[PDB]
Design a binder for these strands. Structure first.
Lengths: 87, 108, 79, 95, 90, 78, 108, 89
DNA sequence: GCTGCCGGCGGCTGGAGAATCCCGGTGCCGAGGCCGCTCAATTGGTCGTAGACAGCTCTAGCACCGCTTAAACGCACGTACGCGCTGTCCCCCGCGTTTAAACCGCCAAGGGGATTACTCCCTAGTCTCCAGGCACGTCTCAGATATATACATCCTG
DNA sequence: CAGGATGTATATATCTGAGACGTGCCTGGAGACTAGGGAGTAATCCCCTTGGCGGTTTAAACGCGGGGGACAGCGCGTACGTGCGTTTTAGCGGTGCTAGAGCTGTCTACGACCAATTGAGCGGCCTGGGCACCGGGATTCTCCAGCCGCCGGCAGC
């Protein structure tokens, strides 16, 4: 559902196939693991016990190369402030 | 009452609660904060939106309505920043980028 | 006597997809050798995964899992 | 046609397509034969068969463009085995 | 004498780049990411020797490629080819 | 500071590599590769140090950075 | 009653308790068994013993009484299987194996 | 892990010592190998949808990473060690 | 024919710079005893994952033949390989020298790290109802064929 | 050095029909609504180790200059990979067919969790003496360039 809505929000007149969506699902799952394990290792590196936005931000800067990283950080910041502004 | 989902308040199209459950049950850390799943959902939405938009533009350039993994490969391999991220990944029925070394063509 | 089932035009087609102009005759066996080393490397992990799972059927999950373990992860198979 | 013209035609023809190059039944037989050496009386899923198939295709395609780079550096147009083991050695699998 | 040196350095282990110029280069390249940075000493030699290992591996790969090219001299095209094959430049 | 890598330094490095003859154009190519590898480690090194709110680049952070790149280091802790 | 260490009962010189503690606060799993720390200690002990014997052989070869990381490099790189297990690991003060290409040698 | 390794030398080479740099290097070695084995074991324990790491997971891990002879020597000593552990409580 | 003649030919001789060994003195610093503390072994109990048994059942390997399409064998041939002669000009390799790293010593202080009172944030516990997965069910516009023209070659004059 | 005939590609008209997209049903998990108690957070102080400074001195880089051989270029022998025709031989498949291995639900039981005591393993901190470091000098160890006896053409007859 969510990938379909993402497609509709950018291309409302473009469809997708079946296997080409399983590819997207595998990609998202792989990136989720690659970021979550990284954030967990940063959390354990400083002898910490909680995972917050700072560790995930550092993992994003580490993983995403350059321009994608700086684009991601801004959107994540606005996304976290709209959450904190109105719970 | 008046239940409200976290995705709507976060302005996202992603199941933030599902990501929070995955983090809790994934054995990454003893305790998990609040904004980490929101940030993860946001970055995932960004990257998947960029990927899907590139695939859609490639499909439109190929004069075809739906999206196939061939267009996925053409869109992924044509962006070096994307290429480095997906350098060690192969896609089902993706094909290769059509290229020829300049030597083996005839003289003129 | 089955590894020879990888016929010569198949290797020629594969190399033309690679983009070669001329093809020798001594590479047809070295390509087969690298092929079998690839496959036995993958299927040893694939079989040991099932053995740990103590089943008798090898699914796509085990093979893609082992492929990703070597650092050659592949999308499109329910990863 | 002049020699190599058909080669160029096939190069431009086949790099655009995406379908497989090895017949399914011989590859299935090869995989089953190899699987006997580790554990006999097994059962295979076709999905795994085509996964192995496409992984093999990707690695061989990789090795072929590396061989092409070795051949062009060797001031040649043909491909020779010294190139294929050079490409295997530089990457480091056979180190 | 070139083969004599080949015999000579292949047995020793110490680093082959002066410490202070390398430290100056590291500080010069690190000032751009952040200003007023302090470097611990052991990290400097760790980075130095890691770079030495990387570079000597690159040299051995390039030499192997050059001798494959039926030549005794190494030229930049060999280095670019080796980098392309190893999957680092592209 | 880039010129601090003197010509005999790369010469002895190449001799340790196992080369016999050296031309006149490996020198700047080598320096560029050296600089690129340096920045590729300083970036995540300063990232790690900034994450910990510290101002000193400990050996632990750089060995972690080398491990992340894929080339582990032995001797400096672990 | 009189207490005794787990390693003495297990006939091992590696700390069973320390390995168990590392597994417990290692975030790896919610629960662990009892034979897993013993197995891990045994395999670590075997690997350390074999690597230290391989270093000691070379140390006595070079007529020295203590191990130097250079000897560790020789021991690791002189065993092809151990080289495969430790291919990407770089050793401090280890240098490189001596090697000269054949063509570089003179005619006779 | 200094004392255990020193006992290892004294049980292998009664007349050979070890430098401090070698000590730190092999300490990092054992830490790296322990982390690799534990990570693979935890990965498998989650991968087969279980919640307890047992000797079977460690056995599969050692059979999975260490190539060749080390694999069967390691599994043999693991089984013998766990058997003498359980036999003598 | 057969005299010199001439240049190489390898075979040997010996001088030449290089690498190695051990003695003899001098340090630097892994290996060992001591104190106590801090965490690890012991008891004692619980309660919940994990093993068994017991079913259901979806599914993968057998075989079977009709068709056919790509694979194997042969065959002129010309192009691309491999080797040999060659003309340099571009690295190597000592030398004077000009220079910059390394030791060596003494400081200040901004930064790293251990303690401490606390507070307030995610976890622990239930209820509830609504978003998402499954079983269909279509009518599509998504494919697929088969048709018809331009084109870039290799020959000719 | 410019045209012609050609096997190629390109476009384009119906077929034509498995399955993305709704459309509902139903269910289980995520939000709504209660403390708590312990993880982090400033605040503090107390080391510390690091950037910095300024004489020697001393091994190392560098421009110069001479030299010799590795390499790119060009030419020629030559042989084997390629374009193409003729079998022929194996893959696709479509049809059933069979039991085997995979999946899930229930009942039980035993082993990891955790709390409270009690004792020793070892991390630390000196400490004496033990094994590497260095110097010079004698001992070999190869590397080179010339002398020389021999040999196979080379002008004559």
């Amino acid at each position: 559902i969510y990938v379909y809505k993402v497609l509709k929000q950018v291309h409302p007149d473009t469809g997708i196939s079946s296997k080409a969506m399983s590819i997207m699902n595998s990609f998202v799952n792989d990136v989720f693991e690659r970021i979550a394990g990284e954030a967990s290792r940063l959390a354990h590196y400083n002898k910490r016990s909680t995972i917050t936005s700072r560790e995930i931000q550092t993992a994003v800067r580490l993983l995403l190369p350059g321009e994608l990283a700086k684009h991601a950080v801004s959107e994540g910041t606005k996304a976290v402030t709209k959450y904190t502004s109105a719970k | 009452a008046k239940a409200k989902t976290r995705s709507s308040r976060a302005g996202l199209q992603f199941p933030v609660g599902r990501v929070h459950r995955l983090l809790r049950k994934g054995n990454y850390a003893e305790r998990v904060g609040a904004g980490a799943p929101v940030y993860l959902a946001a970055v995932l939405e960004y990257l998947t939106a960029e990927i899907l938009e590139l695939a859609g533009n490639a499909a439109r350039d190929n004069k075809k309505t739906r999206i196939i993994p061939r267009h996925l490969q053409l869109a992924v391999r044509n962006d070096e920043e994307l290429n480095k991220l997906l350098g060690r990944v192969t896609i089902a029925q993706g094909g290769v980028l059509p290229n020829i070394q300049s030597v083996l063509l005839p003289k003129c | 006597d089955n590894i020879q089932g990888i016929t010569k035009p198949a290797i020629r087609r594969l190399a033309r997809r690679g983009g070669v102009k001329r093809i020798s005759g001594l590479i047809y066996e070295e390509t087969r050798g690298v092929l079998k080393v690839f496959l036995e490397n993958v299927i040893r992990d694939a079989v040991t995964y099932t053995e740990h799972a103590k089943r008798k059927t090898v699914t796509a999950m085990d093979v893609v899992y082992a492929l990703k373990r070597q650092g050659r992860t592949l999308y499109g198979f329910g990863g | 046609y002049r020699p190599g013209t058909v080669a160029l035609r096939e190069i431009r023809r086949y790099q655009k397509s995406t379908e497989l190059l090895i017949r399914k039944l011989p590859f299935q037989r090869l995989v089953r034969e190899i699987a006997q050496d580790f554990k006999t009386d097994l059962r295979f899923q076709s999905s795994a068969v085509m996964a192995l198939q496409e992984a093999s295709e990707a690695y061989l395609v990789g090795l072929f463009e590396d061989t092409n780079l070795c051949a062009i550096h060797a001031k040649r147009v043909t491909i020779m085995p010294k190139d294929i083991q050079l490409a295997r050695r530089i990457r480091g699998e056979r180190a």
